[PDB]
Each structure stands twice: as C-alpha cells, then as structure tokens.
Amino acid sequence: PIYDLIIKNGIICTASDIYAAEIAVNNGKVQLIAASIDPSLGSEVIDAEGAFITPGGIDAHVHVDEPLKLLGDVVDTMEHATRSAVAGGTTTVVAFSTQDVSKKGPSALAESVKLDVDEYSEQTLYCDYGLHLILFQIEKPSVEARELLDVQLQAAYNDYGVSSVKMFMTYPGLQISDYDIMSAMYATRKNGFTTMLHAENGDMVKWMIEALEEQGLTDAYYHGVSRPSIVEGEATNRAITLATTMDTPILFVHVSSPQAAEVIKQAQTKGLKVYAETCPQYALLSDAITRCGVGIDLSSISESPFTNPDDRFIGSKYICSPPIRPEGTQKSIWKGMNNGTFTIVGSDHCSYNYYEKTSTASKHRAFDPENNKNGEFRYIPNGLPGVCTRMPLLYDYGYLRGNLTSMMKLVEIQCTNPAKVYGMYPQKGSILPGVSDADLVIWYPDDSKKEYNSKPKLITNKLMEHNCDYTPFEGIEIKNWPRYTIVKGKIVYKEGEILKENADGKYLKRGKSFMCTPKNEWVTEWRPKYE
Amino acid sequence: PIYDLIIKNGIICTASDIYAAEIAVNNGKVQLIAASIDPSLGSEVIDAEGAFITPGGIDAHVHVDEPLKLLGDVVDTMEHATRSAVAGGTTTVVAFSTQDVSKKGPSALAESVKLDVDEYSEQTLYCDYGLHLILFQIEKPSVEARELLDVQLQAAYNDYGVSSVKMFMTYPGLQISDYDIMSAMYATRKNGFTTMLHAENGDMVKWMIEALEEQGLTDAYYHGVSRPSIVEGEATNRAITLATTMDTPILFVHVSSPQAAEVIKQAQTKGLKVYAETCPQYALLSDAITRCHGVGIDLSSISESPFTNPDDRFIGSKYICSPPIRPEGTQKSIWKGMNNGTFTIVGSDHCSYNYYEKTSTASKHRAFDPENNKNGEFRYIPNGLPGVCTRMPLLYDYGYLRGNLTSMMKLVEIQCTNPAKVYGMYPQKGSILPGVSDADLVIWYPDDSKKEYNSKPKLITNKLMEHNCDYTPFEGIEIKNWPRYTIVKGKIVYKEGEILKENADGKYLKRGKSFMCTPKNEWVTEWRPKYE
Amino acid sequence: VKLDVDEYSEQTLYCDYGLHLILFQIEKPSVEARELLDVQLQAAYNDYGVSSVKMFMTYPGLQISDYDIMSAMYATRKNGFTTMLHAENGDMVKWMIEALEEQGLTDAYYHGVSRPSIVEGEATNRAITLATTMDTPILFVHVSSPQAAEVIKQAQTKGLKVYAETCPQYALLSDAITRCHGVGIDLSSISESPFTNPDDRFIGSKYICSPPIRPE
Ligand SMILES: [Zn+2]
Ligand SMILES: [Zn+2]
Ligand SMILES: [Zn+2]
Ligand SMILES: [Zn+2]
Ligand SMILES: [Zn+2]
C-alpha cells in the first residue's frame, strides 16, 4: 500500500469547516483529503463510524518537573505529561524553561533552554513538546538591559527555536516592575517574540495576604479572597497600557476575571494586538468547591469538601492562580470564548499529590512546622492537573451542552490558534495535505445507539494516565472521549489504551508567529532606535 | 481523464488556513486536495505560478432588474450581473424577490419568488444565483395574522428554498413600523429564516429632506447631510432591542456608521446573535467625492468625478447610495470592524443606473422629470453603485496587500465562507472541500513576480466590469491584482480578461436554513411564543 | 390652558400651581405647519406663562411619530421651551400586550411583563438622538430603567442638555408588590396589598403605573 493510514466514514472539523471526507496519512503527515479512499491503498484503515475527526489539541500552558525547580517539585515529568496529554486528545504540549541566573553573557538564555531539552531527551515522549522562556531577572538600566537582552533572545531562538517569553506581575521572586517589562517588550518586539504576561497586581496580593493572616484567615478558601477579580483587572489594564506604549503584541495567560476580559475586549475592538488564554476550570468551577448546561454540577465531583467535610485541607486540590472565581463569573468565560476575547484555551497543568503527604511534590508541603509553615493558603502549591481533561471537557460542556457555538470554534481555540500564536503553524494545528503533521483525534459517535465498552462514562484518576494521585474533575459525567489519538501518523492511544511502542515525541523548534508582528502604531512621535 | 481539471503550483487560502497544495476537480465539484497531483490525471491543467487560490466570492447583496420594478428600472439583468460578478471573482450572487401585494393566501410569497425565477430562467447565467425575499406589507393585527404569514414563509421555503427575509426601516412604501417588524420576527424565528434589516430612521430622513429642500439645499451632496451616521445608529439600536425581545437572530445590511458598529459590537460581546454586512465603498470612499472643490482610495485618481468635471453639477449622483458614503475619518472604523469581527460578511449593494444616457427609465437623470414635478433634487436620484465586479479585487488590494485587513484568511472568511454559512449555502458553496464543494474557485496573479502579464489590468475601467452599466465609481484607480481564472462549477468561465460564454451554466439556487440563525433561546422576560 | 385655569379658579388652593402643556396632535408636513405651531407656543407663553411641553412616545391617542417630535422640537427650541418626553416604545408595548392577552396573561402583574426596562431604554435612546439632531434641551419624565439611565448619563457626560426626572416608587418599590407572595421599603410591612389580601386578585392594580414598578 501507499499510505500508512486511512481514516474512513468520519467528519472532518477544522477552525472554519465541518464536512464528511476521508484522510490518507503517510510518513508522519496528512497526504490527502478526498470523498472516498480505496481501503486497499492503506496499511491500516480506521472506520470513524460517523464521528468527528479533529486536529490534535495543542496545550501551550503545561508545567512539568524541571531542573531549576521554580515551582518546587512537580509530580509529572515530560514523559507523564505527554502520556496524559495523548490520552485526552492533546498531541503537542508547550512547557516552560526557567531563566538560570547563574548563566551570564550572550548564551545565558539558550543555556537555560538547554537544561530542559537535555533532561527530557532521556525520557519517553508520547507527543512533541516546545518550550516557553520564563523571565524574572532583567538587567538595569533600561538602555543596556533592553540591548544585551536582544542578543540573548536571538541566541535562544537561533539555537533552540524559542520564540515566546513569559513574565509575571505577581509572586515573590518572579514579579517584575513595569520598567523591566518595558525593557523586555523592547527586546521581544524587535525579535518578533510572542510576549506572555501573568497579570495580577503583586503588591495588592501581598498586602491582602498579610491582612488575612493577621486575622487568622488562613484556610484554602481565603486564597480567592486574597486576590479578587479587580486585581487581575487592574494588572491586565496596566499591561495593555505598557503594550500600547511599546507597540508590542501581548498575550495574557489564564484569564479568569470579567474586568480583565472587558479591558482585553476594548483593546481588540480598537485593533491592538492583544491576545488572551483561558482555562476550562474558569468556565466549569466556582470557588464554592474550595470549602464547605453552563457549569459542572459541583455536588457530583467526588473527594471534595462536600463529600469529605472533616478533611479541612481538601480545598487545596482546587487552589490555583489566578483563583477559581465565585459563582456567576463562569458565564462570562464562555461568552469570551465565543465572542473572540479568548484566542486560545490552555490547561495551566500543574500537578501536586494530595494522597501522599511526605514528598517534596505534595500539596501537604504547606505543612512544614520546622520551616515555619502550618498549612496556610500562602504555602499551598498552586495548580491543578488539566492536560488530559482539557479537550473532552470542551467537547462535552462546550459543544454538546451548547456553551460554545460550534465544533469549529472548539478547534479554533484548542488546536489552530495555539499553533498560529506560538509559531507551530502550519506544521501543527490543522489538517493540511502534504503540510500537517498527522496529529489527529477521532472521537466516538454522538447520536449512536451502539455500545462502546471502552468509552468512559465518568472522569477518574486512572483515565488521566498521569503521575498525579488525583484529578479535580473526579466522578463527573463525560459525554465523549478520544477513541483514537494519532501522533505523527501513529496510533498512540486507542480505546482506553496507550500504545507506548508508538511513542516518538521530540523537542519542537518553533518559528516566529505571524500574529505577533507589530501594528506599527504609536502613542507619541517616539520610535525605537532600530526603526 | 480521471479529473476534468487540475490546479497546480498554487497556494490555497481558506477562512482558517493558507498553504501550498494542489486541487483536482471533476463533475462540477472539488474532488481532492494533495501535495502534488500527476498532470496526466486531468483533462486540463492550470499552473497557478505560486499565486493564491481562493474559493469563489459570494455576493449576497445584488440588485437586478425585476418584474415588479421596486427600485424602478435597473440596467443589469441577472445575465449582466452574473457576467460581471464572474469577471471579478464572484461565483454566487443573491438578489431580491419583491413581495407581490396582488397575490393572496398561503402561496402569496412563493408566487412572488416564482416571478423572478421564471424571468431569469430564459437568460444566460454565468454563475448560480439565489433570492432573498423583500417584505413591506405586513397584515395587522399581530396575533390574527400569525397563521398565514408563517404558512407563507414555509411555502416560500418549501417551493423555492428562500430562507432569508429583508425589511426596511426607511424609504416611503418600504418602511415598516416596529410593530410589524416584531410580527415578522415572530414568523422568521419560528421558521429559522435569516432576518435582514436596512436600519435607518425613516422619519428622521423624511423630516430632514424636507428641511433641506425648504432651504433649496438639493444638490447630490446634501443626500449625506439628510441622513448623518447617528440616524443609522439609532435605527440599528432599535432593531437590536426588537431582536433581543423576540430572541431572533438578526443581520444588518450595508452598515456604514460608527455608532451602528458600536451597538452591534456590544450586542455581539453580550453573545446575542447579531450579524452585520458592510460594503467596499464605505471603507474606500468619503463624501468629498459627491461634490467638487492613506487608508482608502486616493480620490483625485478617480476619473470622471466632480474633481475632474467641475462643470457637471449632477455628476455627484454617480456616488449616491443608501446609506450614504460618509464624511472623511469614518472609513478607518470600517476596516477595524472587518478585522475585529463586527462585520460577518462583505457585500457590494450592487445597484446600477446609467449616467451617460439621460433618456431611459434606468438612468440617474430620471431625477430630471419636469412633468412629474422632478427637477434633479437628490430626493429623486436613484440610489446605488455598480460594485459586484470590483468587490473582491478591491479587498484583495486595499484590504490584504495594503495591510488594512490582517490576512488573506480574513478576506476569504468575510467574502466567501461566512456569506455561504449565513445564507444557507454551506457547505455546497464558500469553501474548498473535496467531494462536497461546488468547484467555485478563483486563481489570482502572483504578487512577488517580475514576470509580465499583458492581460493583468493596471487600472479599473468600465470595459473591465463586463456589465450593462455605462460607468463604474472606481474608474481610473490603480488595482494591484485581478482574477486570472474564475472557475464556476468546474468550468473556466473567465480567463485572463475573457469571458467564456460557452461555459456559462448558472442556475437558480435553492438554499437551506442557516446553522448561524438558530435562536439563542434567551429572553428578557418570562414570556415565550405559543409554539415553544 | 384657559380651560384649566378657569376651572381651578373657583376651587380653594392650598398652594400655587403651574401648568405643563400636553401635545398629541401635530400638523403635517413639518415645514408648512411651522409658523402656526411657533405662533401657538408664543401665545400660550405670552397669555399664560406656559413654558414647557409634554409629549408621549407611547399610549394609543397620545403616542406621536419621531417626525412629529422633530416638528415640536423645532418650535420648542426656537421659543426656549422646556421639552418633556415620556419615553417608552409604544409599538413594542402594543405588540407585547396583544401577545400576553392571546395567552390569557391578563392579571395586573403582566403589566410590567408587557413593557420591560429595555423598551424604556430604546425610546430614551431614540429621543436623545432626536434632541441631538435638533440641538434641543430635553427632559425625560419618570425614568425607571437602568438602560435609560445609562444612555442619559452618557449624553450628560458628553455635555448635551439632557435632564431626567425619577419618582420615589421606582427607588422604593419592586414589582413583587403587584402579585401575591434591600435599599427600599420592606414590602411585607405595607398593609392591604397582595401579601396581606391574597384572595383579592385585583389588589395589584393599586401599584400599576407607567412606566411600571420594576423587578427586584
Ligand atoms: Zn500564571
Ligand atoms: Zn502557569
Ligand atoms: Zn438597503
Ligand atoms: Zn441593497
Ligand atoms: Zn407618563
């Protein structure tokens, strides 16, 4: 035969089309779309049985255990995260490279990337992965700062194809001043890098945590209270102003505040290059889960404060940043996903155990009496596992339950826009013959009366195929799951089973995004020297 | 001879993708997309030479000469308009069926459509056409009338596949009350019809025209003055409020006011099903062209205008349309809306009247009729511009090449794919889907080439338009790309300046219900329609 | 005006009173009718010191077209009159009442349902647009809709001469008082209401006004 793989009787969904057609795959790539393909022409034939075929999901916000241990010890290696990704229909993940301050000179940031790539090259990878760079130490004064940083960015791009930079406006040790952000924007704009911001006002968070602790308000629920939506709103507004002054395209990660969505929308309406990412948990969960159809029925989730009232620390399972918001906020997230405010959807995947209390990668790391830590929300490692559930949750609660307008919108935000915004397009994100890596998901049929013993009814930890001991969505009904996950032409997941022999993931060098070229629009007559 | 046509070496553009690949066509349809296709497998092979291949354009706002003569006599028949469309890369047009008030009962609206279908059936059609229905007579009161109107829409859909209804909030004889619009929305929502509105406050326009004439301010330029953008803003806002109360998806046609774009954006942000169409002339022209003495067209480069011909005081009539072409500084807001999602689609509002013959019922000089107490006042000037041909090339050049649109993908989205989806022609039309798409395709000229193409036009001329009109508003302007091939249902109907009439085989198009026009199921109060 | 002044002149008056003029019949077309209407306002001012005119965008027999309002605004601006509008979309109200009655939804509570705040919002917006084109100061009477208050605030921020009046009942009462069982009054403390008298199905009529008392 001339093709490795033929997918028959399925319905292709892209970011702009839904139609019945067939796909031939060969040499790791999509080779052909036609009405019908002779099954004798392929080595293997998949009958999709009327089900949707989507491109593979691309999750550009995944945190894995890394050598510098910026987020302390995380339970998932790149092996575990990619295994979990694939079991949930995600076929490319992008994690984070931490700036190593012990390195200096022109190669300092390339060297930081090198630590991760070398660490993961020894692991079994189930799909491809790329890396963002995290920046938290910027040299001063500005004119030097912006100029040696330019040579460093070039080096990280040229050596390793890193084309995105992540910065924080919160967290002690990560938070940077506006002055430093401007210096970074100067460098990133010049190099066509994708600039990413975590926008929460760090000073406000800090002051409010101290005020709460002073009153002894330290339980998990007070994490949300310490940082209301207005704080994310202000920081996003400030970040947009900085972006505008610097004419730099900007992406906001894990947006969860209505105020932030408002200012983001205003900028987009003006035509400024402001992009945003949200996460399923911000659409599906409310802060009531932290103590005791549009959203998840919270009472159906198992092993939570509702089911286990005696366990006072179980709210830590749902502690993340920014926090899961109070009731009534979640509808504005779906609206933003539909109306164009959220360009992409990521998971903010960050895993810590709950059912073992002793390891450096536990939530119970918050209890360290000898280190003056007694379980206060401050000391709870922030994050939820979400890389596996991201796609199914959107399929079900988004498409099937009517909260997203169509499958085309689902594909756009989960697959195609992540590729475009992070320089993996067109290799990744669509179904383009002779161009696309054959990264594909075949779902189960929706209107069928046929029985599929392998199709899960509920989300369980075992289904996640990860290294964590819990999932926040444990016990909830899920109405579809990937039936096949195809990565670079090969079936790596089939009907509940991971096929390890077919794991062949590699580090991905990325290009410059075409979405992140500058508008060439300025507030004043000032222009950067290089213009 | 497995395939009728193979397009090689081209770059496929869709609403969501741009990539180099090749296309096989057979039996009027796209058959295959692959990296490379053996040229011996096709009867005819086209070498695209690195140029973009786009789906054919779909222009869902075209006015053709029709038997009831609602807009008086128009110069273009369906033959002429489809010929012109095809020369400009448009491969599907949707015109308008006028409600015939002489016909009564359940079949009254189907019978109105039948008048047009029968008339055009005798003409040579260069591409497919569909029809919208125009409604201006609604029976009163509301409840008592609901049974028949609903029954009438069903019959227009069942017999002829008409699934869109057009209404006016301005013009004497077309304007309808809010009460009647609600009655229509009740019927259209129930039938999943696409509901279209021309939103200008008719009472304000009427009052201000009378005020201007009373002062003797009657020249063509005062057409714009009679209806400033705030009038279009008010009516749009009112129509949104009606659609919200009625939970009815709504499309606004030819939008040109910033205030209208604003209220439209706010509704969309809220998640309401509000769609909008704009036209090239609102992005490219300003009202200075309506009298003498970078984002758009250099107005001084247009030939046969008030600038070039100051003596001819009536020449402003060439650029008179509804809503009017707006003052300088408005046009940026149009592009912005095209990029930021406010404008779902782009149409031409094609409506053709001669300027260089003064005698005929289809002239602009119809405004001069001393006997009928008409003396050239803007009031009496027939409204409209020819635009079906230049719509696609103008967007390609001024939109994509000149940077006013973000990408070729956005161009295809608004010009081709969204019009198909919103008017129930999807997936048959609007994209490049193997085994599914009618092979309606445009091959452009290459952009970065030093090669010379003697057939590629440098300027827009009237001859280039291949229409029945004696003028085009964009005469004399530089155009930086043009369709090199227009393929309609697998056949080359236009190649390098030439129309191939032997390959003309256009048909009336029955349309489905749009998937974008299902209701949100969101209400302002506890009230629900009886049928819910 | 003379009809009212003469009628009240015979009564005992405990304080002073003035009069607004209510307009519901405007001559058409606008240009032809101008000198008379301007001449008529002058006479009402000169003879009786009436300097304010009230118009309705709702109610059968009172509702007037936008065309007619512009005619009036032309005359009022020229004469420095205070121009007052009752802003509800009359066509929407009419259509929705007929819709509710066809379902048999006729109880006093459905008065509010027949005319939700978005109807007052639309009409106010339309009236402001008319005022703007006519450069005529405008006052909105008995405003009770958030949407109307929003568009009124935007106009004032722009510096347009848009004024507004509200009423205590719109601050103090919610439409739960219009049918049988905060910053306003404890509704359970009101006597002889649907709450105290559930048997009396018509007692909601005590709180029926226009625009209606709004939801909580
Ligand atoms: Zn973060
Ligand atoms: Zn993160
Ligand atoms: Zn129109
Ligand atoms: Zn039109
Ligand atoms: Zn009143």
PDB file of N, CA and C in Angstrom, chain B residues 206-262:
ATOM      1  N   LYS B 206     -36.915  61.585   6.309  1.00  0.00           N
ATOM      2  CA  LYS B 206     -38.035  62.322   5.709  1.00  0.00           C
ATOM      3  C   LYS B 206     -38.105  63.789   6.182  1.00  0.00           C
ATOM      4  N   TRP B 207     -38.046  63.992   7.498  1.00  0.00           N
ATOM      5  CA  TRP B 207     -38.096  65.335   8.078  1.00  0.00           C
ATOM      6  C   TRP B 207     -36.931  66.196   7.602  1.00  0.00           C
ATOM      7  N   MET B 208     -35.712  65.654   7.682  1.00  0.00           N
ATOM      8  CA  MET B 208     -34.516  66.402   7.267  1.00  0.00           C
ATOM      9  C   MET B 208     -34.419  66.672   5.754  1.00  0.00           C
ATOM     10  N   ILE B 209     -34.916  65.763   4.908  1.00  0.00           N
ATOM     11  CA  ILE B 209     -35.010  66.047   3.470  1.00  0.00           C
ATOM     12  C   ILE B 209     -35.903  67.267   3.209  1.00  0.00           C
ATOM     13  N   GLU B 210     -37.062  67.310   3.866  1.00  0.00           N
ATOM     14  CA  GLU B 210     -37.997  68.424   3.715  1.00  0.00           C
ATOM     15  C   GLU B 210     -37.402  69.728   4.219  1.00  0.00           C
ATOM     16  N   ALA B 211     -36.646  69.661   5.314  1.00  0.00           N
ATOM     17  CA  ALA B 211     -35.953  70.826   5.858  1.00  0.00           C
ATOM     18  C   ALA B 211     -34.899  71.370   4.904  1.00  0.00           C
ATOM     19  N   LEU B 212     -34.161  70.470   4.261  1.00  0.00           N
ATOM     20  CA  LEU B 212     -33.118  70.853   3.321  1.00  0.00           C
ATOM     21  C   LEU B 212     -33.672  71.447   2.028  1.00  0.00           C
ATOM     22  N   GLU B 213     -34.688  70.802   1.457  1.00  0.00           N
ATOM     23  CA  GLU B 213     -35.363  71.309   0.253  1.00  0.00           C
ATOM     24  C   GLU B 213     -35.988  72.682   0.483  1.00  0.00           C
ATOM     25  N   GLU B 214     -36.562  72.875   1.667  1.00  0.00           N
ATOM     26  CA  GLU B 214     -37.143  74.151   2.063  1.00  0.00           C
ATOM     27  C   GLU B 214     -36.104  75.280   2.005  1.00  0.00           C
ATOM     28  N   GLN B 215     -34.838  74.927   2.226  1.00  0.00           N
ATOM     29  CA  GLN B 215     -33.733  75.876   2.123  1.00  0.00           C
ATOM     30  C   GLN B 215     -33.121  75.918   0.714  1.00  0.00           C
ATOM     31  N   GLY B 216     -33.634  75.070  -0.178  1.00  0.00           N
ATOM     32  CA  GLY B 216     -33.098  74.931  -1.534  1.00  0.00           C
ATOM     33  C   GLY B 216     -31.799  74.131  -1.594  1.00  0.00           C
ATOM     34  N   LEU B 217     -31.526  73.331  -0.562  1.00  0.00           N
ATOM     35  CA  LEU B 217     -30.283  72.563  -0.497  1.00  0.00           C
ATOM     36  C   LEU B 217     -30.496  71.175  -1.095  1.00  0.00           C
ATOM     37  N   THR B 218     -30.510  71.135  -2.429  1.00  0.00           N
ATOM     38  CA  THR B 218     -30.997  69.980  -3.183  1.00  0.00           C
ATOM     39  C   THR B 218     -29.946  69.202  -3.993  1.00  0.00           C
ATOM     40  N   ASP B 219     -28.746  69.772  -4.136  1.00  0.00           N
ATOM     41  CA  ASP B 219     -27.652  69.101  -4.842  1.00  0.00           C
ATOM     42  C   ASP B 219     -27.293  67.757  -4.202  1.00  0.00           C
ATOM     43  N   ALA B 220     -26.701  66.872  -5.005  1.00  0.00           N
ATOM     44  CA  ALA B 220     -26.421  65.490  -4.621  1.00  0.00           C
ATOM     45  C   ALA B 220     -25.689  65.339  -3.278  1.00  0.00           C
ATOM     46  N   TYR B 221     -24.792  66.276  -2.967  1.00  0.00           N
ATOM     47  CA  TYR B 221     -24.036  66.264  -1.706  1.00  0.00           C
ATOM     48  C   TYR B 221     -24.921  66.279  -0.459  1.00  0.00           C
ATOM     49  N   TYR B 222     -26.075  66.932  -0.544  1.00  0.00           N
ATOM     50  CA  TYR B 222     -26.978  67.050   0.606  1.00  0.00           C
ATOM     51  C   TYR B 222     -27.760  65.778   0.936  1.00  0.00           C
ATOM     52  N   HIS B 223     -27.573  64.750   0.116  1.00  0.00           N
ATOM     53  CA  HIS B 223     -28.084  63.408   0.396  1.00  0.00           C
ATOM     54  C   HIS B 223     -27.451  62.839   1.680  1.00  0.00           C
ATOM     55  N   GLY B 224     -26.137  63.016   1.814  1.00  0.00           N
ATOM     56  CA  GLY B 224     -25.401  62.631   3.001  1.00  0.00           C
ATOM     57  C   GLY B 224     -25.823  63.449   4.201  1.00  0.00           C
ATOM     58  N   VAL B 225     -25.941  64.761   4.006  1.00  0.00           N
ATOM     59  CA  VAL B 225     -26.360  65.684   5.066  1.00  0.00           C
ATOM     60  C   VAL B 225     -27.757  65.347   5.624  1.00  0.00           C
ATOM     61  N   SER B 226     -28.638  64.849   4.755  1.00  0.00           N
ATOM     62  CA  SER B 226     -30.010  64.493   5.108  1.00  0.00           C
ATOM     63  C   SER B 226     -30.101  63.311   6.076  1.00  0.00           C
ATOM     64  N   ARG B 227     -29.040  62.513   6.149  1.00  0.00           N
ATOM     65  CA  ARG B 227     -29.033  61.303   6.966  1.00  0.00           C
ATOM     66  C   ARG B 227     -27.656  60.985   7.569  1.00  0.00           C
ATOM     67  N   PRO B 228     -27.202  61.799   8.539  1.00  0.00           N
ATOM     68  CA  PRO B 228     -25.908  61.568   9.191  1.00  0.00           C
ATOM     69  C   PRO B 228     -25.870  60.255   9.996  1.00  0.00           C
ATOM     70  N   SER B 229     -24.672  59.775  10.317  1.00  0.00           N
ATOM     71  CA  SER B 229     -24.432  58.442  10.896  1.00  0.00           C
ATOM     72  C   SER B 229     -25.264  58.097  12.141  1.00  0.00           C
ATOM     73  N   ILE B 230     -25.629  59.124  12.903  1.00  0.00           N
ATOM     74  CA  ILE B 230     -26.411  58.997  14.147  1.00  0.00           C
ATOM     75  C   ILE B 230     -27.830  58.430  13.886  1.00  0.00           C
ATOM     76  N   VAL B 231     -28.327  58.653  12.671  1.00  0.00           N
ATOM     77  CA  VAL B 231     -29.620  58.167  12.219  1.00  0.00           C
ATOM     78  C   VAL B 231     -29.560  56.643  12.008  1.00  0.00           C
ATOM     79  N   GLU B 232     -28.510  56.184  11.330  1.00  0.00           N
ATOM     80  CA  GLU B 232     -28.238  54.755  11.189  1.00  0.00           C
ATOM     81  C   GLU B 232     -27.947  54.100  12.549  1.00  0.00           C
ATOM     82  N   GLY B 233     -27.279  54.833  13.437  1.00  0.00           N
ATOM     83  CA  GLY B 233     -27.015  54.360  14.791  1.00  0.00           C
ATOM     84  C   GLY B 233     -28.268  54.112  15.609  1.00  0.00           C
ATOM     85  N   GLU B 234     -29.191  55.078  15.615  1.00  0.00           N
ATOM     86  CA  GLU B 234     -30.468  54.950  16.323  1.00  0.00           C
ATOM     87  C   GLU B 234     -31.292  53.744  15.839  1.00  0.00           C
ATOM     88  N   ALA B 235     -31.433  53.617  14.518  1.00  0.00           N
ATOM     89  CA  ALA B 235     -32.268  52.566  13.948  1.00  0.00           C
ATOM     90  C   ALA B 235     -31.714  51.166  14.241  1.00  0.00           C
ATOM     91  N   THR B 236     -30.397  51.016  14.107  1.00  0.00           N
ATOM     92  CA  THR B 236     -29.691  49.788  14.472  1.00  0.00           C
ATOM     93  C   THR B 236     -29.927  49.419  15.929  1.00  0.00           C
ATOM     94  N   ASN B 237     -29.789  50.403  16.811  1.00  0.00           N
ATOM     95  CA  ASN B 237     -30.038  50.180  18.225  1.00  0.00           C
ATOM     96  C   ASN B 237     -31.472  49.700  18.485  1.00  0.00           C
ATOM     97  N   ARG B 238     -32.431  50.336  17.814  1.00  0.00           N
ATOM     98  CA  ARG B 238     -33.848  49.972  17.947  1.00  0.00           C
ATOM     99  C   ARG B 238     -34.105  48.549  17.437  1.00  0.00           C
ATOM    100  N   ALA B 239     -33.535  48.226  16.277  1.00  0.00           N
ATOM    101  CA  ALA B 239     -33.647  46.887  15.692  1.00  0.00           C
ATOM    102  C   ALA B 239     -33.018  45.782  16.563  1.00  0.00           C
ATOM    103  N   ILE B 240     -31.883  46.079  17.215  1.00  0.00           N
ATOM    104  CA  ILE B 240     -31.265  45.148  18.171  1.00  0.00           C
ATOM    105  C   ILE B 240     -32.217  44.894  19.345  1.00  0.00           C
ATOM    106  N   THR B 241     -32.737  45.966  19.942  1.00  0.00           N
ATOM    107  CA  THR B 241     -33.741  45.858  21.025  1.00  0.00           C
ATOM    108  C   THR B 241     -34.955  45.005  20.629  1.00  0.00           C
ATOM    109  N   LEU B 242     -35.459  45.187  19.403  1.00  0.00           N
ATOM    110  CA  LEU B 242     -36.559  44.343  18.908  1.00  0.00           C
ATOM    111  C   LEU B 242     -36.126  42.884  18.806  1.00  0.00           C
ATOM    112  N   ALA B 243     -34.940  42.644  18.243  1.00  0.00           N
ATOM    113  CA  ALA B 243     -34.418  41.280  18.086  1.00  0.00           C
ATOM    114  C   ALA B 243     -34.153  40.605  19.424  1.00  0.00           C
ATOM    115  N   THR B 244     -33.698  41.373  20.415  1.00  0.00           N
ATOM    116  CA  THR B 244     -33.486  40.852  21.762  1.00  0.00           C
ATOM    117  C   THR B 244     -34.810  40.409  22.420  1.00  0.00           C
ATOM    118  N   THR B 245     -35.812  41.288  22.397  1.00  0.00           N
ATOM    119  CA  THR B 245     -37.170  40.988  22.882  1.00  0.00           C
ATOM    120  C   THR B 245     -37.757  39.744  22.213  1.00  0.00           C
ATOM    121  N   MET B 246     -37.432  39.560  20.937  1.00  0.00           N
ATOM    122  CA  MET B 246     -38.001  38.493  20.132  1.00  0.00           C
ATOM    123  C   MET B 246     -37.072  37.279  20.008  1.00  0.00           C
ATOM    124  N   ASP B 247     -35.901  37.348  20.653  1.00  0.00           N
ATOM    125  CA  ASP B 247     -34.892  36.279  20.598  1.00  0.00           C
ATOM    126  C   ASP B 247     -34.677  35.806  19.156  1.00  0.00           C
ATOM    127  N   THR B 248     -34.532  36.769  18.251  1.00  0.00           N
ATOM    128  CA  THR B 248     -34.416  36.463  16.831  1.00  0.00           C
ATOM    129  C   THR B 248     -33.057  36.906  16.317  1.00  0.00           C
ATOM    130  N   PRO B 249     -32.287  35.964  15.740  1.00  0.00           N
ATOM    131  CA  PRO B 249     -31.043  36.335  15.080  1.00  0.00           C
ATOM    132  C   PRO B 249     -31.311  37.427  14.039  1.00  0.00           C
ATOM    133  N   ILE B 250     -30.376  38.356  13.896  1.00  0.00           N
ATOM    134  CA  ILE B 250     -30.569  39.482  13.001  1.00  0.00           C
ATOM    135  C   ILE B 250     -29.291  39.868  12.265  1.00  0.00           C
ATOM    136  N   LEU B 251     -29.427  40.147  10.970  1.00  0.00           N
ATOM    137  CA  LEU B 251     -28.336  40.648  10.155  1.00  0.00           C
ATOM    138  C   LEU B 251     -28.630  42.079   9.687  1.00  0.00           C
ATOM    139  N   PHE B 252     -27.687  42.983   9.926  1.00  0.00           N
ATOM    140  CA  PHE B 252     -27.757  44.347   9.409  1.00  0.00           C
ATOM    141  C   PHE B 252     -26.999  44.490   8.095  1.00  0.00           C
ATOM    142  N   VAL B 253     -27.695  44.973   7.070  1.00  0.00           N
ATOM    143  CA  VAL B 253     -27.119  45.121   5.730  1.00  0.00           C
ATOM    144  C   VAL B 253     -26.428  46.472   5.584  1.00  0.00           C
ATOM    145  N   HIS B 254     -25.508  46.565   4.624  1.00  0.00           N
ATOM    146  CA  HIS B 254     -24.706  47.777   4.343  1.00  0.00           C
ATOM    147  C   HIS B 254     -24.548  48.764   5.506  1.00  0.00           C
ATOM    148  N   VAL B 255     -23.738  48.390   6.499  1.00  0.00           N
ATOM    149  CA  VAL B 255     -23.514  49.203   7.699  1.00  0.00           C
ATOM    150  C   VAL B 255     -22.353  50.147   7.429  1.00  0.00           C
ATOM    151  N   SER B 256     -22.511  51.424   7.772  1.00  0.00           N
ATOM    152  CA  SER B 256     -21.506  52.441   7.406  1.00  0.00           C
ATOM    153  C   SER B 256     -21.294  53.495   8.498  1.00  0.00           C
ATOM    154  N   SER B 257     -22.034  53.353   9.591  1.00  0.00           N
ATOM    155  CA  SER B 257     -21.997  54.286  10.704  1.00  0.00           C
ATOM    156  C   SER B 257     -21.200  53.705  11.875  1.00  0.00           C
ATOM    157  N   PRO B 258     -20.257  54.494  12.429  1.00  0.00           N
ATOM    158  CA  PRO B 258     -19.539  54.123  13.648  1.00  0.00           C
ATOM    159  C   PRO B 258     -20.468  53.801  14.829  1.00  0.00           C
ATOM    160  N   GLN B 259     -21.540  54.573  14.996  1.00  0.00           N
ATOM    161  CA  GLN B 259     -22.473  54.377  16.109  1.00  0.00           C
ATOM    162  C   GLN B 259     -23.243  53.073  15.968  1.00  0.00           C
ATOM    163  N   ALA B 260     -23.513  52.680  14.726  1.00  0.00           N
ATOM    164  CA  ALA B 260     -24.144  51.404  14.421  1.00  0.00           C
ATOM    165  C   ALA B 260     -23.178  50.245  14.696  1.00  0.00           C
ATOM    166  N   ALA B 261     -21.944  50.375  14.219  1.00  0.00           N
ATOM    167  CA  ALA B 261     -20.878  49.423  14.527  1.00  0.00           C
ATOM    168  C   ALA B 261     -20.657  49.236  16.044  1.00  0.00           C
ATOM    169  N   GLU B 262     -20.747  50.328  16.808  1.00  0.00           N
ATOM    170  CA  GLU B 262     -20.618  50.274  18.262  1.00  0.00           C
ATOM    171  C   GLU B 262     -21.713  49.420  18.920  1.00  0.00           C
TER     172      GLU B 262
END
